[PDB]
């Protein structure tokens, strides 16, 4: 039960929010490019998301 002004600020907060899903692919595309393609460094994923 909200005023029409008070609903306008609350529908904007529900529809537009900064939060987006994560997986193992986004973390792998987050480290820089030389370390992605280096032989001196060894990297893998050891946790389910």
């Amino acid at each position: 039960i909200l005023h029409p002004i008070d609903h306008a600020f609350n529908e904007y907060f529900l529809q537009h929010q900064l939060v987006e899903p994560l997986n193992n692919d986004i973390i792998f595309n987050y480290i820089p490019e030389r370390i992605r393609n280096d032989v001196n460094y060894i990297l893998n994923m050891d946790r389910n998301l």
Binding site: I1, I26, I27, I42
Partner: protein
């Protein structure tokens, strides 16, 4: 004045989630022995040994 039909709404969101900062904690990191380290040309640096 207070109109009930014009001031009641039905709001929609998610049930649960978790937000993770510090994405690089899901990354296991190891390193080759430093005597066996090579540069870009796949040839060993410190050929002095």
């Amino acid at each position: 004045q207070f109109d009930f039909r014009a001031s009641m709404h039905m709001l929609t969101s998610n049930l649960t989630f978790t937000v993770y900062s510090d994405l690089l904690a899901f990354v296991s990191a190891d390193t080759v022995e430093p005597i066996n380290a090579v540069a870009f040309d796949n040839m060993r640096i410190m050929n002095e040994l």
